């Protein structure tokens, strides 16, 4: 019967893959959405353990001994995309809160801008996510392992950083650095007055920053869903082989 227990766990994985796919196809990923994605991918990992624990050649005949390949796609692929999505989504959500506070930092003066309030908020964003890498979730890996995943995640959202014990793929904070440097270039005394024309380029610039970061996140979500779809197709073949 243990062969059928395997098929019941493999079928529980596809059931989770189905819910995971829907969650990732929502335009906006909320803090609630992330909590659900963590549970599903976590439930995935558990059943991938029981599968290997519990563990026609026509149907078998590329990204993927059966246990040493399913545990390979999840450990060194699905879990990586998952945590990358979590970290970047949390960063973006925290960035959106700063932009939401922007309206209350502008007033007529011709526009007066609270450059200090904006700068210090973005500084906190940078400080907060300096030790929240995309990959790995804990500890470190080899510089070569870190680079392998930078190419897979993209140099737009990630950068290999040296940390105690080895290397990680950190969040690329260049966009935040871009904003902070731009704010420094404005000068002032805590506040600054911008002619209407210059403020219009900054407001529209802030909105463009947001859309760029949103697009970065959606691209990463796309890669996680694609990997999950490759993983589901591998599970598919097994559920029909054991049957």
């Amino acid at each position, epitope marked *: 019967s243990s062969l059928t227990m395997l098929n019941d766990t493999l079928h529980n994985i596809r059931t989770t893959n189905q819910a995971l796919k829907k969650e990732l196809s929502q335009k906006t990923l909320t803090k609630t959405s992330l909590e659900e994605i963590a549970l599903h991918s976590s439930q995935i990992s558990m059943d991938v353990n029981k599968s290997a624990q519990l563990l026609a050649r026509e149907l078998l005949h590329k990204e993927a001994k059966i246990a040493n390949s399913i545990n390979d796609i999840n450990e060194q692929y699905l879990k990586v995309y998952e945590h990358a999505v979590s970290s970047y989504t949390q960063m973006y959500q925290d960035f959106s809160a700063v932009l939401s506070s922007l309206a209350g930092w502008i007033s007529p003066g011709s526009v007066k801008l609270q450059v200090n309030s904006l700068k210090k908020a973005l500084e906190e964003l940078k400080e907060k996510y300096k030790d929240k890498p995309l990959y790995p979730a804990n500890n470190t890996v080899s510089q070569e392992q870190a680079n392998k995943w930078l190419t897979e995640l993209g140099g737009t959202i990630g950068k290999v950083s040296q940390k105690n014990g080895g290397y990680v793929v950190s969040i690329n904070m260049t966009p935040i650095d871009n904003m902070l440097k731009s704010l420094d270039n404005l000068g002032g005394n*805590g506040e600054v007055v911008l002619d209407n024309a210059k403020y219009q380029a900054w407001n529209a610039g802030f909105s463009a920053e947001d859309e760029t970061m949103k697009n970065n996140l959606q691209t990463l979500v796309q890669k996680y869903s694609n990997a999950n779809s490759i993983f589901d197709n591998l599970v598919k073949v097994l559920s029909s082989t054991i049957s």
Partner: nanobody
Amino acid sequence: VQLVESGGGLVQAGGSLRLSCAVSGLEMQSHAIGWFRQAPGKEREGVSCINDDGSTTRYADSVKGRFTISRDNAKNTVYLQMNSLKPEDTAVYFCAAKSVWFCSVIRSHEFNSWGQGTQVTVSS
């Protein structure tokens, strides 16, 4: 949302006090929490703030190096260690929370919830 301060009282100039803020009614791990003070006649004044995960703390120039803010997301408590107290520090001290995760410049009108305050009196 309820914010309850304790730890105030009377103290001699040069002495110290530790304020404690009991936070009830909000996911404390998601909001910046800070301390304000208001002496009579003078305007409310930002003192310190600590963002939702504690990776940044902020202090007014008047208290930098003397005060220390800390938070315990577990115990739903925020502390303000007040050392090297001066008569200038005499005021009602308020615990306050923001709707956002970050501190930025401490500004009273950007804080969502307020405690009743507790008196700190420094006599030289």
